[PDB]
């Protein structure tokens, strides 16, 4: 009935006239996820990969990897025999390291603010699992498990010399030695790997059992929708090569005029990036390349110039400034010169009188996301804000950096997937245009001064 | 590079200067879903809820329920005695049918602009299955395998008093017949059913075994985005009873002024319709139900009444007019009539300037809809342009009606899920308020006259 709207999301909340003696109480149950399997099934990928997601769509997530808690307390791996299952000694720090981390877990969890807790290791026995989610169970945390499963070893082959051998346990081992010792660890776990029973003996248990790479798909009951998100995610990524390229939109008449928003054409330089950008595309030599513009003008002038068939997404339209829309910096300074304020000190929250913040563009490019995780090559000619919430993605960049990435004009950003994430090129069309990029940038309200 | 904005939609196109004697050429191959299960496991069901879902967010899709063709040819059921195995007459009408509607789906897919053929029977043998397969490829069509397996008499039983007994082919039976000879029925198809086998015979085929009412999940090989969106679709649905309510903020201050969009708080009468409510929903006396709001102030102020905790959804704001926010339809009329003619001819796709359309609302509540399919008793306070989007997915109804459906203030419709869809309940609360409903509303361009 009364409420009042906060001044940076624009979110109306009741007003509190707090009482004499304001109260305050505070801070949906967190949940840990279980990785499952033998070494070298990319569980520390998905881990990772899963994690960089879910941060981004808002879910304060952690990685526990229980891999760099014995690192921290052996100091320097030398073989495969730290892991024997007849080296007592050693299953007894990897137990040690495996409680420490649900310390860590747990605090996350219950004292951090954290939502889901990644318990990243091979968990491989009933008895390791049941021990979990007795953890789970005494601390009112929900238990998720994902399996990955894979008996290709022309894959547990190229897991190894794509992410083991460089890996710090063998600094000191060349290529044929790490591949070795590998293996051999691996097949330590052997003898006691009990996989997961969704039909017995973990008829009980919310898990989704990944086969094949991603080919094949066991789902055992989904309690929430974080969990129904999870399954939807690790269903769509794959580790097929690729390559995914973004650019904005070439030079347009708004640039020139230091304008936000609005729905203008390409300057006379923008058209000369939207032809260069055709011949990089074509130097690239993809076999084939999907290419996406926003809705808007400037996106789309640009993808015609390359003669390739392109998808229009409204999701990728620039984020809406609101009543500020058509302006120029300088005239938000002095018509709003409060909004202009309050925007400077919380970039990714503030969102524009009738318009969007960073946080509102994220929730509309979820769909954008997940249908990049799906396809393969793929160019996406975008805007500024939006480019900087896609690379904030894939980067792994947080919400407060978010805002402030550099993404010039007339430039393509290259990700090549590697290893357990992405590396990033940048490509300069050598084509001039405007810098739209701006960086960050009380004495009465205390006695004497 | 030269494009032009279309009238309706606002979306930027080529400008194609046809030649003097202009060409067209015209109209992502279809696909072929094919149900799988014995009788009275909720393929039919499955078949209706998918299609009203994939029509809804613009999937063009149809059903080809071949128990129809069968009424159809044959009349009158008898008895289970159709079905028997050893009844080779009958085998033959129902091959026949099944090909019927096969040609019926090639009619649909190849012709008539479907891109979704829900293949509805039992398809419980590899032979039959084998054949469709045979009729996929050979007309370039992709193919999509649903199996529902339930072996809790408990389930089927309820199935078959819930949708069966009430089935035309009972209409001369009482409930205890109708019962015993489903149940004959279900078992003539026992002995020869094989179920999909992805870890060997079926290894190659793409499918979704659906398990225990969705409690567990098999899924092999998804290929494209739409069989993507469908497994995630089916994964998320259940069957527990529970109920839906949908209804408007209370009345507004625009609502008085005829001004659209805004964000204006509620008036005295929508006040007392916020009371009254909550009277409402106290007297219903659901153990639990969530609600949910737009993150407008009119929605916010009227859950506020409530006294019960809710949960604010950017997604269920109201259309955004564009630059005729804040206007009375009068002053559209006066300032934009070409606008306000367009919208009038079309107003399921047109684009306000700078705003949306209903067809963008859909897109903007498939998030909606999905998290309301996982939910229990749900109240979803919002607005018109977005409850006539919830309503018409719902209720099954076209785009050309939706944005014409009735949604009065002060007005709570009571979904409750029965048989193959959703009952609806009106009930009006008693308190005045505004109508803002607005229904649909040459000759010198031809000689003489
Ligand atoms: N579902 C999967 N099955 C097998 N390998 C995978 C899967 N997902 C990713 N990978 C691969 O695994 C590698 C990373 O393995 P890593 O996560 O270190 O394995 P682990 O943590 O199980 O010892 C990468 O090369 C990646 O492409
Ligand atoms: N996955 C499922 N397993 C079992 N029953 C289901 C499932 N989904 C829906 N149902 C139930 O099945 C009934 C509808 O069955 P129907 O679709 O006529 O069966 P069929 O078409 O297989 O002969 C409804 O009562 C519905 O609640
Ligand atoms: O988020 P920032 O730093 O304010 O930049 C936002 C602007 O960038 C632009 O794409 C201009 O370069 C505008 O259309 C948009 O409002
Ligand atoms: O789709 P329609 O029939 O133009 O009604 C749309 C309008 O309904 C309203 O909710 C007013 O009742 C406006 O805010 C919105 O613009």
Redesign the interface.
């Known amino acids: 009935?009364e409420?009042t709207?906060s001044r940076v999301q624009?979110?109306?909340v009741?007003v509190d006239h707090r009482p004499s003696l304001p109260r305050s109480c505070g801070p949906n149950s967190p949940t840990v996820i279980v990785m499952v399997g033998l070494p070298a099934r990319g569980k520390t990928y998905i881990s990772k990969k899963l994690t960089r997601y879910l941060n981004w769509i808002g879910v304060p997530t952690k990685v526990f990897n229980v891999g760099e808690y014995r690192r921290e307390a052996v100091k320097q791996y030398s073989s495969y025999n730290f892991f024997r299952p007849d080296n007592e000694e050693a299953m007894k720090v990897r137990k040690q390291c495996a409680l420490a981390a649900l310390r860590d877990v747990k605090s996350y969890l219950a004292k951090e603010g954290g939502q889901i807790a990644v318990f990243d290791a091979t968990n491989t026995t009933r008895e390791r699992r049941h021990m979990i989610l007795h953890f789970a169970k005494e601390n009112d945390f929900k238990a998720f498990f994902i399996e990955s499963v894979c008996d290709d070893p022309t894959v547990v082959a190229s897991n190894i010399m794509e992410v083991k051998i460089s890996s710090p346990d063998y600094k000191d081992c060349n290529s044929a030695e790490a591949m070795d010792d590998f293996m051999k660890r691996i097949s330590c776990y052997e003898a006691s790997y009990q996989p997961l029973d969704?039909?017995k003996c973990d008829r009980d248990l919310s898990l989704i059992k990944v086969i094949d790479v991603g080919?094949?798909?066991?789902?055992?009951?989904?309690q929430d929708?974080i969990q129904?998100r999870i399954?939807?995610y690790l269903?769509?990524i794959h580790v097929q090569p690729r390559t995914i390229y973004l650019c904005r939109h070439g030079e347009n008449e708004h640039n020139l005029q230091g304008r936000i928003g609005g729905?203008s054409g390409?300057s006379s330089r923008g058209?000369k990036f939207?032809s260069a950008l055709s011949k990089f595309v074509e130097e690239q030599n993809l076999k084939d390349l999907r290419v996406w513009t926003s809705?808007?003008?400037s996106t789309?002038?640009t993808a015609?110039?390359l003669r390739l068939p392109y998808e229009?997404w409204?999701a990728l339209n620039e984020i809406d400034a609101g009543v500020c829309?058509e302006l120029t910096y300088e005239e938000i300074r002095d018509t709003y010169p409060e909004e202009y304020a309050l925007r400077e000190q919380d970039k990714y929250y503030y969102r524009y009188p009738?318009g969007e913040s960073y946080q509102?563009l994220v929730?509309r490019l979820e769909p954008v996301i997940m249908?990049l995780e799906?396809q393969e090559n793929v160019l996406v000619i975008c805007h500024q804000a939006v480019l900087r919430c896609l690379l904030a993605y894939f980067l792994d960049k947080s919400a407060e950096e978010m805002p402030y990435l550099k993404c010039p004009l007339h430039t393509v950003l290259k990700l090549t997937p590697v290893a357990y994430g992405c590396r990033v090129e940048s490509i300069y069309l050598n084509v001039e245009s405007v810098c739209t990029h701006r960086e960050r940038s009380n004495p009465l309200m205390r006695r004497n001064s």
């Open positions: 009935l409420l709207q624009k979110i109306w009741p969704p039909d080919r094949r798909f066991l789902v055992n009951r989904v929708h129904s399954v939807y269903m769509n729905d390409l058209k939207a809705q808007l003008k789309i002038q015609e110039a229009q409204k829309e009738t509102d929730q249908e799906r």
